[PDB]
């Protein structure tokens, strides 16, 4: 998975944290190729249905490509069951897409966050290569490594303590999402324009913008 | 052309014409009996249609498809002793069996080939122009597990396992006959397993035991065809006990 030419090295990071009764998912709305921004609109969070909201990040084209796949399966399972499904279905359908592009895999990371039809709110990571896991908190992309240390010290707490030595509270996680986004702007040179945070209850999305530049 | 003539018409009978009709052929020409034993599941045939100038190597009425599964058949139709229809079915079923080994190893189970064969005739009922094969094969074998199985397929393609089952020269008659002979003792003992086969064959005895050809097959091991000469040894003694029951 590489993009100097073949795929879009269009930067951008989303971070999603699951508590156990919300997901806050925060991403920039800048679409850019290389260090340059192409155009200032277009949010990288996209809602497949209404009851699920996915965040796709890396190249924007790859992001549009992944949502379609997650969306066409997300409806199919809903039709069949006659009742909705959410978080769990998006990760699991990625497994199928990842097999599809076995020979050269799509450099996009989709993280579906909403509530699953098995219960309790879930922000799940598949990566475009294959593999599935549930995370405690996770931020993913080409700057993936930058959220990870915040989540690793607080949420996992493997010979560490932070605010509480337990997976962090709803009030703290929403603040933590806002926090990382400011820090990213200095450090990284692709993050720009405004950061839009979507908080999902499991059925509905609310959006709040924050300017940073 | 007429509605009745056509291959498509589900008929007042409530079942497709060509499937029904293939089922009414499983008596006459050749006879195949197979009984289940612990150490050998044994099939025997009577009538290979040999004048005894005809090669017995060419005509297979007992052919091993795998290295632990073998089958013997009989059937009804136009022109006696008809090698052809049975022979295509041996060729596709045996290759498929070898292909199964290559895909997913060790000798392939009795029940799986039997499932494949029953479905093979079935798919044909959908397929263009194709009626199902009228054949019932007594699939005789041992599993890789070593659990002895005796399976039988029918012309529509529904299969059932049995302890002991007989077909041909009137299927219903030979099935009924075999049920008096079968006992739980018969399955345990190695001498009785052979005699049980021979005992169903004899109610349409033709030309010695040299006409009758038996094979024993073991857990993972190739088909061993007992000599045309050995078979005769059982028949002379048994045939006398046979007269009394019917």
């Amino acid at each position: 998975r590489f993009s100097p030419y073949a795929f879009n090295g269009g930067t951008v990071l989303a971070i999603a944290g699951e508590d156990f009764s919300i997901v806050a998912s925060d991403t920039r709305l800048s679409e850019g190729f290389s260090i340059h921004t192409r155009d200032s609109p277009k949010c990288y969070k996209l809602t497949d249905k209404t009851v699920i909201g996915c965040s796709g990040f890396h190249g924007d084209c790859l992001t549009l490509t992944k949502i379609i796949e997650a969306r066409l399966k997300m409806y199919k399972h809903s039709n069949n069951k006659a009742m909705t499904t959410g978080a769990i279905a998006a990760m699991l359908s990625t497994i199928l897409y990842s097999r599809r592009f076995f020979p050269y895999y799509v450099y996009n990371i989709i993280e579906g966050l909403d509530e699953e039809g098995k219960g309790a709110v879930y922000s799940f990571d598949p990566v475009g290569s294959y593999q599935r896991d549930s995370f405690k908190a996770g931020g993913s992309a080409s700057a993936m490594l930058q959220p990870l240390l915040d989540n690793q010290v607080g949420f996992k707490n493997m010979q560490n303590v932070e605010h509480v030595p337990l997976t962090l509270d709803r009030a703290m996680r929403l603040v933590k999402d806002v926090f990382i986004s400011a820090a990213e702007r200095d450090v990284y040179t692709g993050d720009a324009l405004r950061i839009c945070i979507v908080t999902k209850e499991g059925i509905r999305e609310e959006t709040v913008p924050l300017r940073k530049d | 052309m007429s509605y009745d003539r056509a291959i498509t018409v589900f008929s007042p009978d409530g079942h497709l014409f060509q499937v029904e009709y293939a089922q009414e052929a499983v008596k006459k020409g050749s006879t195949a009996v197979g009984v289940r034993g612990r150490d050998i599941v044994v099939l025997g045939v009577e009538k290979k249609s040999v004048a005894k100038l005809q090669d017995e190597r060419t005509v297979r009425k007992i052919c091993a498809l795998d290295d632990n599964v073998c089958m013997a058949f009989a059937v009804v139709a136009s022109v006696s002793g008809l090698t052809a229809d049975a022979r295509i079915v041996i060729n596709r079923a045996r290759v498929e069996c070898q292909s199964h080994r290559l895909t997913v190893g060790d000798p392939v189970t009795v029940e799986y080939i039997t499932r494949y064969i029953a479905s093979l005739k079935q798919r044909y009922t959908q397929s263009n122009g194709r009626r199902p094969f009228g054949i019932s094969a007594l699939i005789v074998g041992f599993d890789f597990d070593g659990t002895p199985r005796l399976y039988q397929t029918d012309p529509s393609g529904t299969y059932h396992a049995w302890k002991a089952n007989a077909i041909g020269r009137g299927a219903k008659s030979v099935r009924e006959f075999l049920e008096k002979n079968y006992t739980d003792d018969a399955i345990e003992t190695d001498d009785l397993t052979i005699k049980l086969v021979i005992k169903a064959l004899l109610e349409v005895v033709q030309s010695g035991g040299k006409n009758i050809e038996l094979a024993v097959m073991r857990r993972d091991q190739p088909l061993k065809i007992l000599s045309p000469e050995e078979i005769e040894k059982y028949v002379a003694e048994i045939e006398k006990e046979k007269e009394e029951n019917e």
């Binding site: - | 190597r57 060419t58 297979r60 052919c63 091993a64 498809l65 795998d66 290295d67 041996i90 060729n91 045996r94 290759v95 070898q98 292909s99 080994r101 290559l102 190893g105 190739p222």
Partner: protein
């Protein structure tokens, strides 16, 4: 270098064959206790030697194919025929993106042409001859058979020749003495001979 060691000594009827167990991937022996000598039947045995993948894949396929021929004719596959048959197979396979090349030895007794033992090259060149080796060892194993016997000396002395060849396997190439799979194939079937 071509491939790891093999040494094979045909007696004059019997053929005594050995290959290392050592099927090594990365830098460890994954397997070290299994025979990659295949029973394609009882009257014919084929012993496939080469890379790790081509050995198991080509022979397992061949085996199931051997059995199919047996049913059809109702006689064991013919030995002469098997010698040409293995040459068409290995040339056809050879182009495939996953590389197939086998240094093969067919051993059979047939009631037809007779006995056959086949030397077969890495250039998919078929020859019957008596004395064969596998790997860059084919040159090493053929050479001691030319001088020290006229390739009609007893199997017992041949074993002593084999012990000396195996000592080379410790010296010139990398393989350790630890395990070698040894089988002698004659008319009856395969006989398990002692490991080294």
């Amino acid at each position: 270098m071509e491939y790891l060691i093999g040494i094979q000594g045909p007696d004059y009827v019997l053929v005594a064959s050995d290959r290392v167990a050592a099927s090594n991937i990365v830098q460890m022996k994954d397997d070290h206790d299994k025979m990659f000598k295949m029973s394609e039947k009882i009257l014919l045995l084929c012993v496939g030697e080469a890379g790790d993948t081509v050995q198991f894949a080509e022979y397992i396929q061949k085996n199931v194919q051997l059995y199919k021929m047996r049913n059809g004719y109702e006689l064991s596959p013919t030995a002469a025929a098997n010698f040409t048959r293995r040459n068409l197979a290995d040339c056809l396979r050879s182009r495939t993106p996953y590389h197939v090349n086998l240094l093969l030895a067919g051993y059979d007794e047939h009631e037809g042409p007779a006995l056959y033992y086949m030397d077969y090259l890495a250039a998919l060149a078929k020859a019957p001859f008596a004395a064969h080796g596998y790997g860059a060892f084919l040159t090493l194993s053929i050479l001691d058979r030319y001088y020290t016997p006229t390739i009609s000396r007893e199997r017992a002395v041949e074993l002593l020749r084999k012990c000396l060849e195996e000592l080379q396997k410790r010296f010139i190439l990398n393989l350790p003495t630890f395990s070698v799979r040894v089988i002698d194939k004659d008319g009856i079937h395969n006989l398990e001979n002692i490991t080294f």
